[PDB]
């Protein structure tokens, strides 16, 4: 109970066999693995009382599950599909429902892994309106044309992490949504002071970390693999 | 337990006002009862449970909860909503003795703007030849942006900073296109702006 999960993250695709990884350090007899997703909460999988015990949750249809050890419970996807693009938690408990969560799985299942598309990344200038009007300056950040809908944007002043003055969207946008594989697009806002956006010593940007395909993964296309990877956009302050 | 009850997916709350979600459960004997909160993209971290000790529960950073067997309710409260108090928030049961969670409330704070200065702004690509976004940007809460009627128009929801260095949150919602006839003056055209909103020159 440090409480391990691994992967992180994975892309897939359709029709693989994936395995999830829960390890625990206590020796707690309990073990579960959840699924999470928006509007439906965490739903339980599988869960498990000891190393000859395994029972059915409420969505165990489509996976597996194995009980190798006291530390350590197995969650299988038999054969990947795009329904199964979730969060996954495991879980231990002691005998009084005291549990501890593993940090989690982002897993997505697509069916075509030649739509995978790392984004385009572009900073927008604050208007000199704005500056003039309120004496404060928004930056925009665009990440447009990704697909699959896996990524983590940050912006970085002077070579370090800022959440003050951020908003980023909470989900992206699909470019073209009558299509199921849409790629997706991303805005996010940094504002600061019109002084201190008026410092042209001052360097922003806006980054983008994108969760594609690994090095193992065939590509047929010209264009370019479209890896697991950071994109990033940046401006410099301007006097005016 | 049967079953742990919220409902409202998306729940709003006055900035400095009273936070009440509401948890209802279904079990005969009385359950254990807890509430889980997930700030966005982490994990899960207990704020309180009861657990047939307390009936008043209190958890971290002024939390309560109140287990009321004959409402047969868990209502979580806090006594005045801050802007980092947006998140999810999860109620959930024991039940058959050996595990079951709600479907979640997100929790938005709506900004105390006190001196809303709406207004329409072009921005301009940094490098580019030459793109740019339209922000539509210090409205207050009782403005919101609808979504957009032209297909090759986008158009983010509204979105609340919170900028430190001065204490001053804004709102804010980016449109954009690639569009020849797409002028900022006319983006926000779908969605009710203040009379007032200011459209520079």
């Known amino acids: 109970a440090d409480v391990t999960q691994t992967p992180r993250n994975r892309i897939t695709k359709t029709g693989k066999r994936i395995m999830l990884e829960c390890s625990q350090t206590?020796?707690?007899?309990?073990m579960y693995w959840y699924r999470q997703d928006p509007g439906l909460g965490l739903r339980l999988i599988y869960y498990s009382f000891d190393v000859k015990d395994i029972n059915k949750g409420e969505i165990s249809d489509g996976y597996s599950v194995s009980r190798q050890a006291q530390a350590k419970f197995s969650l299988s996807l038999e054969s990947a599909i795009p329904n199964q693009t979730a969060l996954y938690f495991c879980?231990?408990?002691?005998?009084?429902?005291?549990?501890?969560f593993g940090s989690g799985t982002r897993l997505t299942v697509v069916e075509d892994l030649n739509k995978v598309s790392p984004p385009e990344v572009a900073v927008f200038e604050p208007s000199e309106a704005e500056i003039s009007h309120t004496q404060k300056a928004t930056l925009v950040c665009l990440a447009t044309g990704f697909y699959p809908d896996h990524v983590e944007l940050s912006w970085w002043v002077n070579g370090k992490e800022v959440h003050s003055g951020v908003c980023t969207d909470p989900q992206p946008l699909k470019e073209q949504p009558a299509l199921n594989d849409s790629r997706y697009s991303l805005s996010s806002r940094l504002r600061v002071s019109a002084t201190f956006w008026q410092n042209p010593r001052n360097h922003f940007r806006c980054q983008v970390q994108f969760y594609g395909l690994s090095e193992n993964d065939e590509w047929t296309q010209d264009r370019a693999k479209p890896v697991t990877q950071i994109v990033s956009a940046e401006a410099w302050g301007r006097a005016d | 337990a049967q079953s742990v009850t919220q409902l409202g997916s998306h729940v709003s709350v006055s900035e400095g006002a009273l936070v009440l979600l509401r948890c209802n459960y279904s079990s005969s004997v009385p359950p254990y009862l807890f509430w889980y909160v997930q700030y966005p993209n982490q994990g899960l971290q207990l704020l309180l449970k009861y657990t047939s000790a307390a009936t008043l529960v209190k958890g971290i950073n002024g939390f309560e909860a109140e287990f009321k067997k004959s409402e047969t309710s868990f209502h979580l409260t806090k006594p005045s909503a801050h802007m980092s108090d947006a998140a999810e928030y999860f109620c959930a049961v024991s039940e058959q003795d050996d595990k079951i969670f709600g479907k979640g409330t997100r929790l938005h704070i709506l900004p105390n703007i006190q001196n809303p200065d709406p207004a329409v702004y072009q921005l301009r690509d940094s490098k580019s030849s030459d793109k740019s976004v339209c922000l539509f940007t210090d409205f207050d809460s009782q403005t919101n942006v609808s979504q957009s009627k032209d297909s090759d128009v986008y158009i983010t929801d509204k979105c609340v900073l919170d900028m430190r260095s001065m204490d001053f949150k804004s709102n804010s919602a980016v449109a954009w296109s690639n569009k020849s006839d797409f002028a900022c003056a006319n983006a926000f055209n779908n969605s009710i702006i203040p009379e007032d909103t200011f459209f520079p020159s």
């Open positions: 206590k020796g707690h007899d309990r």
């Open positions: 879980a231990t408990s002691d005998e009084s429902y005291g549990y501890t």
